[PDB]
Amino acid sequence: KLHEIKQELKDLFSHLPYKINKVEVSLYEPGVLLIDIDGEDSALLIGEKGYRYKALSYLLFNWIHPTYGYSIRLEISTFLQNQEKVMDTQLQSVIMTVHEVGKGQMKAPDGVLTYIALKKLRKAFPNKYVSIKTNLNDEKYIVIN
Amino acid sequence: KLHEIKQELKDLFSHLPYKINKVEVSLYEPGVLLIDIDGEDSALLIGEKGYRYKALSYLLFNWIHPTYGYSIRLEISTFLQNQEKVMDTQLQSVIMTVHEVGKGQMKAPDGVLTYIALKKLRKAFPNKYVSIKTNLNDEKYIVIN
Amino acid sequence: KEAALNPLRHATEELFGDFLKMENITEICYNGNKVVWVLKNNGEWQPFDVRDRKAFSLSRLMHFARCCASFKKKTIDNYENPILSSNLANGERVQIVLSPVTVNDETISISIRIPSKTTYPHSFFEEQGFYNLLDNKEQAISAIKDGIAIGKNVIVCGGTGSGKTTYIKSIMEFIPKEERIISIEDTEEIVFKHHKNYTQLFFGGNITSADCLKSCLRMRPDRIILGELRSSEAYDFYNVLCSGHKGTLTTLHAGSSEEAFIRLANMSSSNSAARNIKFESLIEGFKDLIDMIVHINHHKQCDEFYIK
Amino acid sequence: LSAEDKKFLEVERALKEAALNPLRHATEELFGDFLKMENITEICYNGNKVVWVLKNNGEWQPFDVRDRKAFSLSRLMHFARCCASFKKKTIDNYENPILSSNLANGERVQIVLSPVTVNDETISISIRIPSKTTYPHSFFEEQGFYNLLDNKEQAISAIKDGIAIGKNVIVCGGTGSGKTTYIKSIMEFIPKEERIISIEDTEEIVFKHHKNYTQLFFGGNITSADCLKSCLRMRPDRIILGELRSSEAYDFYNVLCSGHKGTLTTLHAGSSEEAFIRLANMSSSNSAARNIKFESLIEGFKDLIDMIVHINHHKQCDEFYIK
Amino acid sequence: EAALNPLRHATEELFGDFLKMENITEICYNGNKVVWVLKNNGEWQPFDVRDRKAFSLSRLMHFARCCASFKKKTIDNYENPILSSNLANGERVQIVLSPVTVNDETISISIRIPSKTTYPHSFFEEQGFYNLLDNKEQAISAIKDGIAIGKNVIVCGGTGSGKTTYIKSIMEFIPKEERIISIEDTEEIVFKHHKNYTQLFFGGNITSADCLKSCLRMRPDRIILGELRSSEAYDFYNVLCSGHKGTLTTLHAGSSEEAFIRLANMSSSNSAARNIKFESLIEGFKDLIDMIVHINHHKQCDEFYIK
Amino acid sequence: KEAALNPLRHATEELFGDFLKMENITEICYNGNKVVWVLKNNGEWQPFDVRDRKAFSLSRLMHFARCCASFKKKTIDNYENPILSSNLANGERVQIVLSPVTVNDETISISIRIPSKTTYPHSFFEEQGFYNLLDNKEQAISAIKDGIAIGKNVIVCGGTGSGKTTYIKSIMEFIPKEERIISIEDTEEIVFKHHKNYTQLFFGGNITSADCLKSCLRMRPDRIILGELRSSEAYDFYNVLCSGHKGTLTTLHAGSSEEAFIRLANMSSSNSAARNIKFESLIEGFKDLIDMIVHINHHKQCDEFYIK
Amino acid sequence: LSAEDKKFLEVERALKEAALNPLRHATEELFGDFLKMENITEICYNGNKVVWVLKNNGEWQPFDVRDRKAFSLSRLMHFARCCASFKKKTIDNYENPILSSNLANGERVQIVLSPVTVNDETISISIRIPSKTTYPHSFFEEQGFYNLLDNKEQAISAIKDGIAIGKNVIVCGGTGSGKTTYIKSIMEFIPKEERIISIEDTEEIVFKHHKNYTQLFFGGNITSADCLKSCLRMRPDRIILGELRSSEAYDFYNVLCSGHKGTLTTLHAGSSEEAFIRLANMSSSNSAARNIKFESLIEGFKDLIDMIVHINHHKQCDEFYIK
C-alpha cells in the first residue's frame, strides 16, 4: 500500500511539475501514515497561510483513509513541526487554566492542528470531556469540562 | 504529613498488638500515598479472602484523604501485587474483546481493584466511555462502549 | 460448587438450624440483640432468646453473612456493600444489612423468607372459599378455568405471605397439558404437575430477568410464567405480551387492580427504553393486554377479580 | 478466630476515630459551649461575632464571641473544610460557596461563603440539633396540642384508632413544629406485636413499646430509597419513614401502591393541601415520575393518604385531615 | 492588606471624588471623558474629566487589570474583553473593552453602589402612599397586622414605582425576634430592626434558586426574596408550601390579576414545572398569597388586594 | 489591524469598487459566471457583465474570500468551512459560499448587503404614510410616542430591505434624552442623535450576542436596543425582559405579530437552557412582556400594529 | 500567482479523482451496462443473480448475471465497502449490515447484508437514478396530467398564477411520481427577474428561464439546514428546496414564518392531509420542535402552505389542494 501511494504522488508531481525531491510514505503511529514531501517548490505546496497544506492534508486523507484504511500526517519541509511548536505554547497555557479552574477553552486551530490539539488535550485530561463546540458566532472552540 | 500518618499507624499497631515489622508511608503517584505494611502477623490484616485488607484500604482512605488530601495505595506483604497480576489476565482479555468488537464488560473486582481496573481500562480506551454500571441483579460491572 | 456450599450450610445450621426446622413458619428475623424472631403462618411473631448461645457472636454472624454473599458470587461489607440480598443453600431468600446502615458497629440485621413449598390443587382453593367474598364469584371461576384454557394474560397480586405463587401453581391445571411452558424465576418454586414439555429459566449474576424474558421469545413457548415483577423488567414483560404468545402468568405486589396497572407502568417507566414514553401510554398498553387480575387479601382470599 | 475478628474491630474503631478527630476538635473549638446547652434546636453564626442559639421554646438567644480566637476567619474556614471533606464535598469562595454537610454526631450543617454572603469576611453557619427528648402522648393531651380543634376528643380517638388499624398517616408542619417528637408519641398506638422498620439519616425515633424492630440509616452512597428497597425485603408490619425531602417520595408512593398499609412519615408543609402539592413536587424529581402529570401525582396521593396532622408554629394541631 | 492596596490606590486615583458622593447608586464611564453618576432620586449627572491625566487609556487599563487580578480573572482586548469584578471594599464593577466597545479608545466601566438607606413607614403614610384607597386606615392596619402575624405578601409595580423602598419599610412590622434571610442580586435591603439575619446573593453560576434552597436549610423565620424574575417563581411556590411564615417579595406587574398570571407563567418556565398545568399553578398562588400591594408611577398604592 | 486591513480593501476595490460606489443600491451578488448582479432600492436586479475584467478570476475571487475571512478571524476553504458570513472593511455584510456547496470547482457565490446608512426623523415616516394603511392609525402613533416615552418593549418586524433598523432609529427620538442607552449589534448601524449617555456593544469571535445581553444587565441601562434576534439569544433576550428595565427595542424577521411570537419561542427553544420548557410557556412569556409589535411590509409601510 | 493557483487546482482534481477511482471502477464492473441504459429510475440486485431495472414508464426488467464474475460475493462486498468508505461509513455482517450511501455521480445506494437479509450469500443493492430529462409544462398539459381534476383549466390557471405571485407550493407523491420533473416545469411561471436559490443534494433542478441564481448542495458535514441558513443571507426572491426528508422541515417552517413567500418544495405523501402530517412528523425530530404539540405543528403548516399538488402512481394529479 505504501508503494502504491508513493507511486501515485511521484506520478502526479511530474504530470504537473513541482520541484519535488523527497516523497516518503511511512508508518507513523498505529493506523497513521506519515507523508513527507520536500524540495525547492515546497512553499508552493504550503500556500498563502498554509491553505494549500490544509487542502493537501484533507485530500490525502479522503484518498488514503477510504482506500487503504489509514489516517494521515502530512509534512512539507518543517511547516507542521513549526505549527505544532507554536500551538504547544497556548496549549500548555490552557492545560494550566483547566488545572487551576477545571474549565477551559481554546479556539480550534487550522486543519489537522485541531485534531492534534484534541488528542493532546484528551491525554492530559482523562478524566474530562474534551470536545469541539461551536458558538453563536459560528466560531469553533475546543472545550474542556 | 507522611510523618504524622506513620506516627499514628505505629501508635495504633502497639495499642493493639500485631507482629508488625514495617510501616512505610511514601509518595507513590501524584496525589497518592503508598502505605506498606509487613510482618509475621501480615495475613491477619489481609483476613479471610482479603476482607480486612479491603476494610483497611477504605478506612485509610477515609482518614488520609479528608485529612491530608491524599488518595492511598495499600500493600500488605505481596497481597495487592498478586491481585493486580491475577486481574491483569482477565483485563488484557477484556480489552481484546473491546478491540475486536467495540463493546466490553468485566465484573467489578473487590475494593480498590475496581478503581485500579477503571484507570487501566480508561487508559487503553481513550476515546471510549469506561464507567461502572449496575445490573437488575444489583451486580456491578465495568462497562466500555 | 461444594467448596463454597459446605461453609454456608454449616454456618446456617449453627445459627438458624433450630428455627429452620420449625413447621408452619414464614419468616425468621434477627435484629442484632440476641433475639431470633419467628413469624408463624397464623401471623404471630415469636421471640426466642439466643444470648446463651455461643453460636451468636459478631464474628460468627459476620462469617455467615460473607458465606451467604459468596454463595451467590456477591460481596458484603461495612463499606460499599452493607446491604445484601442473597439465598441460603436450599434457596430461601436472605436479606442482610450491616453498619453503617444499621444503628451501630455491633448490629447485624438478618431476614430469612421461608417459602411455602406445598402444592395445593385448585379444587382445594374453591372448597376453602377463595372466591366466596366475590360478587362476580361464578364468572371468576369460569374465567380462571376457561380463560386460562384458551390462553389469557393473568396477574395474581397481593402482599407478602398472601400465597400468590401457591395460587399460581393451582391455576396451572387449566393450561392444557399439550402446551410448552417456560418459567422465569429467582428461585425454583413453580412445579410442573400437568406438563411434560417445559423449560425452567433462572436469572442471576450477569443474566437478568430481562435476559430470560428476551430468551424465552426465541424458545417457542405456548405459555410464559414469570415468577414476579419487581422493576425495569416490567417493560420487557410488556414486550413479551406484545409478541402475542398464547398466554402468560405473573405475580406482583399491589393492593388492587387499578394499583396493579399504576404499578406496572411505574416499573416500566424506570426503564431507560421508556424514558420518553407518556405514563398514560404505558398504563393503556397494559390495560390492552392484561385479561384478568386476581387480588388476594391478607387472609388469603380473593377480594377483587378484575376481568377485562 | 472470633478473637482475631474481635481484635480487628478495635483496629476499625481506632481508624474511624482518627478520621473524625479533626472534625470533632474543630467543632468543640468553635461550638463546644453551645452544643452542650440544654433544650436547643439550632445554632447560627452570621459572620459578625455573634452566635445565635434557638431554644425548644422558640426563643433566640445571642452570644458575643468577639473575644474568642476560634471565630477568626481562618479557624472558621478550617472548620468549614473539615465539614466539607467529611461528606466528600468541597467548599470554596468560587464555584462551591454553599455546603450542606454533617457534624460527627450527625447534626446537619449549612455553610455559606463569599461571594454568596455579603463580603469576604462573612461566613454563615447553621447547625440543626436532632429531636432528642421523647414525650408520651399524654403530654400532648395535657399541654393543649388538640385544643384548637372544635372536635377535640373525636380527633384524638381518630388518631389512636387509625394508627392501631394501620392507616397511612402523615404529620406535617414547619421546622420546629415538633413533627418527630409527635410521631414518636403516637407510636404508642401501634400494636406491640408489630414488626417496625424505621428509615432515617440519624437516630431520632425511639422504641419504647416495641421489641421487634430494625433501624435503617442512609448517608453517603446509601440513599433513603436504598433503605426503603431493603425494608420491603425485611418483612415489616409497619414502616416509619422519618422524613420526606425529595425523590424518595415517589418510592414511598409505590410502597403505598404495593398493598402496604400502616406507613408513618413526616414532611414540611403548611396544611394538608400543601402536603399533597409538596408530595407531588418531591415525587416529580424521580425517574419513574418524569413523564407523569402533576395532577395525576396529586390524585394518587389523595387516594392513599388516610390522615394528615398539621402542626402550627406554636406546636398545636390546626388541621386534622381525615380522608 | 498588601494585595488589597494597589487596587485601593487605583480606585482612589480615578473614582475618588465620585465614590465619596452621598445618596448615589451608580457610577458609569463610557470611554468619552464623561463620568455619569446616578443619584437616588433617579437622575443622571455628567462630570467632565477631560482635564485629568488620571483618565488616560494607560491608567484606565491599569485599573481594569487590578480589578481582574483582584478576583483572579483576566481582561484583555481578545478572548476576555468583558469583566465582572469588585472594588476593594466590595462594590460590583463591570468593565468592557475593545473589540466589544465601539473603537480603539473606548473603555466602559460601571460601578454599583449598595444601598444603606431605609425609609421609615411613617414617611409613606405622610407622603400619601395610602391616599388613593377608599379603605385607607383598614389597609394600613392590614399591612401592619399582616406582616406581624406572618402573611405572604407581594409588592408589585413598574420600574421606579419604589417597590423595594416600600418593602424595606414594612420590614418594621416583622417582630424583632425573627431570624430573617434575604435573597438578592444587589444589596438593597438594610436591616435596622433585626440583629439575627443572613444575606444571600446570586450571580454567575449561583442562581436565585440555589439561594432559595440554601435558605430553607438555614432555619429562617422570614424569607425576603428581593425580586421575582422567572423560573425561580416555582422554587418560590414550593417555599410557600414548605410550612414557613410570611414570605415577602417584589414583582413587575400592573395589578393583582396580572401578578397571578405572571407568577404562573414564570413558574411554567421552570424545568420541574414541565408536567404541571397553568391552571394548577395559578390556583396554587391564589390559595397562598394573602396580600398584593400594587404601586403606580406616582409611587402610590392604587390596588390593595386581600385574599 | 491595518496589516490585515489593507489586503482586503484593495481586493474589494479591485473586484466590487465600481458597484460599491453605486447609489441607492441594497445588494451586490456574484454567482460564479462573470455577472455582477446589483439589487436597486426600487427592487430591480441589474446585471453587469465582468467577463472582460482581468480582476475577475478564480484566484482573485479566492484571494478576496480569504481576506474577507481573515479580517474577522475566520477561515474559508473547500473543506470544512465552505460557507462564510463576514464583513467588508467598512462593515457591510458578506456571505461567501464555495465548492462543494456550490455546483462546481470554479463557482464562487458572493452576496454583499448594502446598509441604508441614512437617518430619517420620525416626522418623515408620518408624512410618507407609514401608518396610513392602519385601521388603528392614531392609536399606533400615540402608542409609539407615549408608549416609548414611558418605557415599553417593542419589536419591529418585517423582511429584508423593509427598513426595520431605519424605523428603529426614528422612534429613538421618543426615548427621553435623560435615559442611559445600551445597544447590542453585529455592525454599527444605530445612531445617537438625542442621547449623550450611551454605550455601544459589539459581538464577535469569543463574545456572543448572549454575552452582550448578560453584560448589559450589569451596566445599569434604562434602555436596551438589541439590533436583531436570530437564534438562541432570544432566550437570553427574554431574561433581559424579565429583569424589567425601563424598555427594549429590537428587530426580527416575521410576517405578522402572531408569527413574531411563534418565531421568538422557536428561537428560544433551540437554546439548551430551554430544552425542557413547554413551547406554550415560551410563547406566553413573550406575550406577557412584549407591548407593541410593528410589522413593516415589502413596500416599507406598516400593515399591522399590535398593541398589547 | 494566478498561475500557481491554476496549477494547484490540477493537483486538487488529481487527488479527488484518485479518491473516487476505486468506487468508479467497482461501480462500472458491476453496474456499468445498466447505468448506461436510457430512461432508468432504479437498479436493484436481490442476492440471486438477477439485476432488476426499473424504467421511467414503470416497467421492471430482469437481467441474468449468473455468468458474470462481478456478481461474486467478494466482488459485491468490495463494492459495498467502497460505497461505505466513500461516505465515511462502515458496512459489515454484525452491527452495520444496513448502509445508505452514494455513487460518484451522486446517485443514492442502499445496501443490506446478512443477518438482515435472508442468508450469508444474499446481498441487497438498490440504486436510485436522479431525475435527468427536463420537460416543459406544455408536456404535462398535453399528456393528461390534469385530466382527473373536474376543474381542469381552473387548476392550471391557479398553479400558473399562484407560482407567479409567490405562493408557497408543495408537490407531493410517491417515488417515481415525477415530483421533481414537475417542479422544474412550473419554474417557467416564476417571473424571470427573480433571484432563485435552490437547495439539493445532487444537481437535478435546471435553470432555463432564469439568469440570477445559485445552486446549493448538502452532503457530509453540510446539512440542508446549513444551506437554508446560508440561503437567507444571500438575498433570494425564491427558495426552491429540492425535497423535505427530516428535521429540516422545521427549518423550512421557520423560513415560512420569517416573512418569506414563494417557496417551492417536494415531499413523499399520498395526499394533502398526509403531506401536513408528514411535515409535522419530520419537523418533530428537530431541536426547536421537541416540546411542540403535534397538533400545533400541523395547524402551523396549514396556515402557511398555499397549494399542494399530489401526483398518483400513473403520473397524474389526483388532488389539487388550494388554501
Coordinates of N, CA, C and O in Angstrom, one line a residue, chain E residues 73-109:
Chain E
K73 N -9.2 36.9 37.9 CA -9.7 36.8 36.5 C -8.7 37.6 35.6 O -7.7 38.2 36.0
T74 N -9.0 37.6 34.3 CA -8.2 38.3 33.3 C -9.0 39.2 32.4 O -10.2 39.0 32.2
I75 N -8.4 40.3 31.9 CA -9.1 41.2 31.0 C -8.1 41.7 29.9 O -7.0 42.2 30.2
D76 N -8.5 41.5 28.7 CA -7.7 41.9 27.5 C -8.5 42.3 26.3 O -9.8 42.3 26.4
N77 N -7.9 42.6 25.2 CA -8.6 43.0 24.0 C -8.8 41.9 23.0 O -8.9 42.1 21.8
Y78 N -9.0 40.7 23.6 CA -9.1 39.5 22.7 C -10.2 38.6 23.2 O -11.4 38.9 22.9
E79 N -9.9 37.5 23.8 CA -10.9 36.5 24.3 C -11.7 37.0 25.5 O -12.8 36.5 25.8
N80 N -11.1 38.0 26.2 CA -11.6 38.4 27.5 C -11.9 39.9 27.7 O -11.5 40.5 28.7
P81 N -12.7 40.5 26.8 CA -12.9 42.0 26.9 C -13.9 42.4 27.9 O -14.1 43.6 28.1
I82 N -14.7 41.4 28.4 CA -15.7 41.7 29.4 C -15.4 41.1 30.8 O -15.1 39.9 31.0
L83 N -15.3 42.0 31.8 CA -15.0 41.6 33.2 C -16.1 41.9 34.2 O -16.6 43.1 34.2
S84 N -16.5 41.0 35.0 CA -17.3 41.2 36.3 C -16.4 41.0 37.5 O -15.8 40.0 37.6
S85 N -16.2 42.1 38.3 CA -15.4 42.0 39.5 C -15.9 42.9 40.6 O -17.1 43.3 40.5
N86 N -15.1 43.2 41.6 CA -15.4 44.1 42.7 C -14.3 45.0 43.0 O -13.1 44.7 42.8
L87 N -14.6 46.2 43.6 CA -13.7 47.1 44.1 C -13.2 46.5 45.5 O -13.8 45.6 46.0
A88 N -12.2 47.1 46.1 CA -11.6 46.6 47.3 C -12.6 46.4 48.5 O -12.5 45.3 49.1
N89 N -13.5 47.3 48.7 CA -14.5 47.2 49.7 C -15.5 46.1 49.4 O -15.7 45.2 50.2
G90 N -16.1 46.2 48.2 CA -17.0 45.1 47.8 C -17.9 45.4 46.7 O -18.7 44.6 46.2
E91 N -17.9 46.7 46.2 CA -18.9 47.2 45.2 C -18.6 46.6 43.8 O -17.4 46.5 43.4
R92 N -19.7 46.1 43.2 CA -19.6 45.4 41.9 C -19.2 46.3 40.7 O -19.6 47.4 40.6
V93 N -18.3 45.8 39.9 CA -17.7 46.5 38.8 C -17.9 45.7 37.5 O -17.6 44.5 37.5
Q94 N -18.3 46.4 36.4 CA -18.3 45.8 35.1 C -17.4 46.6 34.2 O -17.6 47.8 34.0
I95 N -16.5 45.9 33.6 CA -15.5 46.5 32.6 C -15.6 45.9 31.2 O -15.5 44.7 31.1
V96 N -15.9 46.7 30.2 CA -15.9 46.3 28.8 C -14.9 47.0 28.0 O -14.8 48.2 28.1
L97 N -14.1 46.2 27.2 CA -13.1 46.8 26.3 C -13.3 46.5 24.9 O -14.2 45.7 24.5
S98 N -12.5 47.1 24.0 CA -12.4 46.8 22.6 C -12.0 45.3 22.5 O -11.1 44.9 23.2
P99 N -12.5 44.6 21.5 CA -13.4 45.0 20.4 C -14.9 45.0 20.6 O -15.7 45.2 19.7
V100 N -15.3 44.8 21.9 CA -16.7 44.8 22.2 C -17.2 46.3 22.3 O -18.4 46.6 21.9
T101 N -16.4 47.2 22.8 CA -16.7 48.6 22.7 C -16.5 49.1 21.3 O -16.0 48.4 20.4
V102 N -17.0 50.3 21.0 CA -17.1 50.9 19.7 C -15.8 51.0 18.9 O -15.7 50.7 17.7
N103 N -14.7 51.4 19.6 CA -13.4 51.6 19.0 C -12.2 51.4 19.9 O -12.3 50.9 21.0
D104 N -11.0 51.7 19.4 CA -9.7 51.6 20.0 C -9.6 52.4 21.3 O -8.9 51.9 22.2
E105 N -10.3 53.5 21.4 CA -10.2 54.4 22.5 C -11.3 54.4 23.6 O -11.4 55.3 24.4
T106 N -12.1 53.3 23.6 CA -13.3 53.2 24.4 C -13.2 52.1 25.5 O -13.1 50.9 25.1
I107 N -13.3 52.6 26.7 CA -13.5 51.7 27.9 C -14.8 52.0 28.5 O -15.1 53.2 28.8
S108 N -15.6 51.0 28.9 CA -16.8 51.1 29.6 C -16.6 50.6 31.0 O -16.1 49.4 31.2
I109 N -16.9 51.4 32.0 CA -16.9 51.0 33.4 C -18.2 51.3 34.1 O -18.7 52.5 34.0

